[PDB]
Write a protein that binds this ligand. Structure first.
Ligand code: NAG
Ligand code: NAG
Lengths: 48, 49
């Protein structure tokens, strides 16, 4: 009915209605990093 | 799952450019490229040093 990764994270499921098979991928997340020169030089920034 | 893997700053195809520069210095210029100047020297004379 459902599938596990090497570390026992669940990573696939059957739809119980149409018995086709779905992968589960986490919703994307990550660090917002601000690239800045020194404030003395400029107030402009770029965001990674 | 909260866990992340960040990339290295020097990519593997760019570490391999430094190892190439280090041995291409070593093969053409002995140790001298450590002491600032890459002085060429023919290799059978480097091995005599
Ligand atoms: C496993 C199974 O019986 N699946 C059926 C599906 O084939 C059908 O299209 C649907 C209709 O509502 O009902 C459910
Ligand atoms: C940087 O900011 C400090 C504090 O205002 C100031 O003393 C210094 O002169 C500044 N230097 C430059 C290059 O802007």
């Amino acid at each position: 009915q459902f599938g596990r990764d090497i570390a026992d994270t669940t990573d696939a499921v059957r739809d119980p209605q149409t018995l086709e098979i779905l992968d589960i991928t986490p919703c994307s997340f990550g660090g917002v990093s601000v690239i800045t020169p020194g404030t003395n030089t400029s107030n402009e920034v770029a965001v990674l | 799952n909260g866990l992340t893997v960040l990339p290295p700053l020097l990519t593997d195809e760019m570490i391999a450019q430094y190892t190439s520069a280090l041995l291409a210095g070593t093969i053409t210029s002995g140790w001298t490229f450590g002491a600032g100047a890459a002085l060429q020297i023919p290799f059978a004379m480097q091995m005599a040093y």
